[PDB]
Structure 1
Amino acid sequence: LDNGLARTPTMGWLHWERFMCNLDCQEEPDSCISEKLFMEMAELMVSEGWKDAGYEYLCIDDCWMAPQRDSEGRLQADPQRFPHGIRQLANYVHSKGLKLGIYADVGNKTCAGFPGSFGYYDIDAQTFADWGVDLLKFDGCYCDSLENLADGYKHMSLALNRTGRSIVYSCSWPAYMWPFQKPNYTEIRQYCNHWRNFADIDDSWKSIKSILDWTSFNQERIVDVAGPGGWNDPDMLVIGNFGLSWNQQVTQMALWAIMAAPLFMSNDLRHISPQAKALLQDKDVIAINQDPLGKQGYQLRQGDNFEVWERPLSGLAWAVAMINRQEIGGPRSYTIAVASLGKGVACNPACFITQLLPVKRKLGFYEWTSRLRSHINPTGTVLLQLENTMQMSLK
């Protein structure tokens, strides 16, 4: 989308996976969806260095709204869970140097059952612009036809544009087209900053794999459309929660960087392990994600329960991810000829290889004819940065 936004993938925090549609502030004041929840996250996004790592969008997902529009036809913040309304909350966030994200639906209702924006796109756009919203996740639920789907999405895109305010526009458009409807990514790209392609993530290795596989399987179709201002969204980072082994967390962090995915953490910033924080704030990995060339990576090859993914980076450098998919035994030795990497350019005449995950370690120079041996934990990933020796010498 040509709104000057999301020149690199958008980073931030989104409540959904972690917190869902929890409306019980009486029994569960600390994890029901409320202005309090977001304010707490906002403080911690600053105090815990999340803002500095690049996480800047604090995003409200579904179930922030009251059950109907006000007498002027505007969506309303739930009166008991957002007593000071969205404006004040946006103000709060802005005072922190962060930006605010919000959630709406293209159809008659949000997925949770709250007011959809169908028939209110302009009102809703204007409402969001005025509150000072900076990002909108626009979901596909409760849409009667694909014609409508496509229209609503395009309409909201213009409606937002017309408000004159910069708002990152996130469209679940393509996801609601799958499996039998080949979405037009050229068209989607034009209206959206990023787009959800596939099913909702959750706190499981199953789900991660499902996403990785769906992505690689569908790669020719989607990798090349992605770039500055328009990204493929494989959903929230779920690192730091409950259902992932450490190795699996690493794999997500690694692969989301390779895939140039937006980085929306969904977790409790109040209770997050020093490791998780370290991984999610990993500055070399984040740099790979945020590489300014903005070229999404791909699966290079797979077999014997290994996968190799690689991503071209600015400076003719390359990210390389090696995933051990075998879920039994111990660290498994993997060997690849550096010649195969970076379509044979990465390491010609040589390349310097730095390992980034699971730990940062310099591995030195590999001539183009040489082989790289790794040991990769079951469900883990080794992330690598290749520096071509030629470009290195150049200052």
Structure 2
Amino acid sequence: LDNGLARTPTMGWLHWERFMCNLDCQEEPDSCISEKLFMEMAELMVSEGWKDAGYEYLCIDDCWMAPQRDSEGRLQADPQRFPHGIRQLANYVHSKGLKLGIYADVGNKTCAGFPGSFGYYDIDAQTFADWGVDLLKFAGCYCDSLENLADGYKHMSLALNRTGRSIVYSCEWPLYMWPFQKPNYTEIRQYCNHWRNFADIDDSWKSIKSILDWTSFNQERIVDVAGPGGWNDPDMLVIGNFGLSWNQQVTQMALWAIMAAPLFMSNDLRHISPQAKALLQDKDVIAINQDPLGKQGYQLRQGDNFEVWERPLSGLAWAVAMINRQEIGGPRSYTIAVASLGKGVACNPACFITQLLPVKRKLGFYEWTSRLRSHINPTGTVLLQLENTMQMSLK
């Protein structure tokens, strides 16, 4: 979407995976979907270095709305969970140097059953803009046809544009066309800053594998369409929660960087381990994700339960991820000819290789004809950055 936004993948925090649709503030006030939850996350995004690392969008997902629209046909924030309203929340978030995301649905209801935006696109867009909303995640539940789906996504895009406010537009458009209708990504990209292609992530390694396998399976269709202003969205980072081993967390962080994915954490910033914090704030890995060239990576090869992915970067550099998909045994040796990497230009005549994950380590100079040996933990990933030696010497 040509709105000057998402020139690199959007980074922030989104409540959904970790907090879901918890409406019980009586029994669980510290985990219910409430203004207090978001104000606390906003404070910690500043104080715990998240904003500094690049995470700037504090985003509300489903279940913020009151059951009905007001007498002027406007969406309402829930009166008891958001008693001070969205505007005051937006002001609070802005005072921290952060941006606010909100959620709506193209159909008659949100996925959780609250008011949908169909028939109210213009009113809702103007409502969000006036509040100072900076991002909209627009979901595709409760839509009677694919024609109405597409039209609704386009209408809301134009309506947001007409407000004159810069608002990141995140769409679930192509997801709802799966598996029989092939999305027109040229069209989707014209209207959206990012788009969900695949089913919801959850707190499991199985879901991460499924997203990676569906991405690589469809990579010819989707990789080249991504770029500054329009990204493939493989869903939230779930690092720091309950269902992932350390190696699986490393794999998600590495691969979301390779995929030029928007980076929306869904976790509890009040209760997150130092290790998970350090991984999510990894300066070098975020720099790969945020690479200005904005070319999405891809799976180069797979076999013997190993996967090699790579991403072209600015300065003729490359990021390379090697995944051990064998879920038994110990750290497993993997050897690759560097000549196979980066279309055969990355290490011609030579490259300098730095390992970034699971630990940072300068590996040295590798000539065009040489081989690279790594040991990779089961379900883990080794992430490397390759610099072509001619680029290095030249200023």
- TM-score tier, shorter chain, comes to over 0.9
Find the aligned partners of 1:109 and 1:281 in 2 and give their Cα distance. Answer: 36
Find the aligned partners of 1:390 and 1:6 in 2 and give their Cα distance. Answer: 31
1:184 deviation in Å?
A: 0.4
Find the aligned partners of 1:162 and 1:68 in 2 and give their Cα distance. Answer: 25
Find the aligned partners of 2:80 and 2:264 in 1 and give their Cα distance. Answer: 27
1:81 deviation in Å?
A: 0.2
Find the aligned partners of 1:142 and 1:185 in 2 and give their Cα distance. Answer: 22
2:154 is matched with 154
1:42 deviation in Å?
A: 0.1
> Which deviations, in whole Å up to 9, do the C-alpha atoms of 1:80-133 show, x marking residues without a partner?
000000000000000000000000000000000000000000000000000000
2:379 is matched with 379
2:169 is matched with 169
Q: Which runs of 5+ in 2 are unaligned?
A: none
Secondary structure at the counterpart of residue 316 of structure 1: coil
> Which deviations, in whole Å up to 9, do the C-alpha atoms of 1:5-30 show, x marking residues without a partner?
00000000000000000000000000
1:313 deviation in Å?
A: 0.1
> Which deviations, in whole Å up to 9, do the C-alpha atoms of 1:187-241 show, x marking residues without a partner?
0000000000000000000000000000000000000000000000000000000
Alignment of 1:113-152 (within 5 A): 113-152=113-152
Find the aligned partners of 1:181 and 1:81 in 2 and give their Cα distance. Answer: 39
Find the aligned partners of 1:80 and 1:296 in 2 and give their Cα distance. Answer: 43
1:300 deviation in Å?
A: 0.1
**Alpha carbon RMSD of aligned pairs, Å?**
0.2
1:177 deviation in Å?
A: 0.6
Find the aligned partners of 1:137 and 1:195 in 2 and give their Cα distance. Answer: 9
Secondary structure at the counterpart of residue 310 of structure 1: strand
> Which deviations, in whole Å up to 9, do the C-alpha atoms of 1:277-308 show, x marking residues without a partner?
00000000000000000000000000100000
Find the aligned partners of 2:212 and 2:68 in 1 and give their Cα distance. Answer: 38
Find the aligned partners of 1:103 and 1:373 in 2 and give their Cα distance. Answer: 46
Secondary structure at the counterpart of residue 314 of structure 1: coil
1:245 deviation in Å?
A: 0.3
Find the aligned partners of 1:365 and 1:68 in 2 and give their Cα distance. Answer: 64
Secondary structure at the counterpart of residue 38 of structure 2: helix
Secondary structure at the counterpart of residue 339 of structure 2: helix
| 2:238 corresponds to 1:238 | yes
Find the aligned partners of 2:305 and 2:253 in 1 and give their Cα distance. Answer: 20
Alignment of 1:173-184 (within 5 A): 173-184=173-184
2:60 is matched with 60
1:146 deviation in Å?
A: 0.2
1:343 deviation in Å?
A: 0.3
Secondary structure at the counterpart of residue 150 of structure 2: helix
> Which deviations, in whole Å up to 9, do the C-alpha atoms of 1:322-356 show, x marking residues without a partner?
00000000000000000000000000000000000
1:393 deviation in Å?
A: 0.4
Find the aligned partners of 2:361 and 2:202 in 1 and give their Cα distance. Answer: 31
1:390 deviation in Å?
A: 0.4
1:361 deviation in Å?
A: 0.2
> Which deviations, in whole Å up to 9, do the C-alpha atoms of 1:349-372 show, x marking residues without a partner?
000000000000000000000000
Find the aligned partners of 2:68 and 2:308 in 1 and give their Cα distance. Answer: 49
Find the aligned partners of 1:154 and 1:117 in 2 and give their Cα distance. Answer: 13
Identity over aligned residues, as a percent? 99
| 2:49 corresponds to 1:49 | yes
1:59 deviation in Å?
A: 0.0
Find the aligned partners of 2:92 and 2:172 in 1 and give their Cα distance. Answer: 28
Secondary structure at the counterpart of residue 355 of structure 2: strand
Alignment of 1:1-395 (within 5 A): 1-395=1-395
> Which deviations, in whole Å up to 9, do the C-alpha atoms of 1:108-166 show, x marking residues without a partner?
00000000000000000000000000000000000000000000000000000000000
Find the aligned partners of 1:312 and 1:98 in 2 and give their Cα distance. Answer: 30
Find the aligned partners of 2:181 and 2:27 in 1 and give their Cα distance. Answer: 43
Find the aligned partners of 1:120 and 1:394 in 2 and give their Cα distance. Answer: 56
Secondary structure at the counterpart of residue 322 of structure 2: strand
Find the aligned partners of 1:300 and 1:130 in 2 and give their Cα distance. Answer: 46
> Which deviations, in whole Å up to 9, do the C-alpha atoms of 1:234-283 show, x marking residues without a partner?
00000000000000000000000000000000000000000000000000
Secondary structure at the counterpart of residue 260 of structure 1: coil
Q: TM-score, normalised by structure 1?
A: 1.00
Find the aligned partners of 2:209 and 2:190 in 1 and give their Cα distance. Answer: 29
Secondary structure at the counterpart of residue 182 of structure 2: coil
Find the aligned partners of 2:68 and 2:393 in 1 and give their Cα distance. Answer: 63
Find the aligned partners of 1:159 and 1:50 in 2 and give their Cα distance. Answer: 32
Secondary structure at the counterpart of residue 232 of structure 1: strand
Find the aligned partners of 2:243 and 2:39 in 1 and give their Cα distance. Answer: 26
Secondary structure at the counterpart of residue 244 of structure 1: coil
Q: Which runs of 5+ in 1 are unaligned?
A: none
